[PDB]
């Protein structure tokens, strides 16, 4: 599914991400924008053989099992395919663990380089919610 900007904001809020670990909804929308362009089915291979999955591009090196990332962990206890669903529940639950892990939203390199410190409220501007 390719979400609309407000549609995703609404789904994120419904799944309790709005202000989770102090990160406003616009942070999460901005992260999803630059990670996946709002496409639940986004996958991208990393140089090291791991793969990033879904709306928030969660990496198989740590967080999910794809069966082809030697030496990786699966800390969200989920197949990486579950992170590609049109329903964002699994991606949200896993993102919640990632953002609690110590470095906050810096875990998402696109959030660090493209969202951090910016006017992230623009991402939810005009959304009913
Ligand atoms: Cl947009
Ligand atoms: Cl915001
Ligand atoms: Cl693996
Ligand atoms: Cl699995
Ligand atoms: Cl959803
Ligand atoms: Cl933080
Ligand atoms: Cl709206
Ligand atoms: Na893994």
Swiss-Prot record:
Its main location: secreted. The keyword Nucleotide-binding does not apply. Substrate binds at residue 101. In the egg white and polymorphonuclear leukocytes. Its EC number is 3.2.1.17. Keywords: Allergen, Antimicrobial, Bacteriolytic enzyme, Disulfide bond, Glycosidase, Hydrolase, Secreted, Signal. The active site is at residues 35, 52. It is found in: Secreted. Belongs to the glycosyl hydrolase 22 family. This is Lysozyme C. It comes from Gallus gallus. The gene is LYZ.
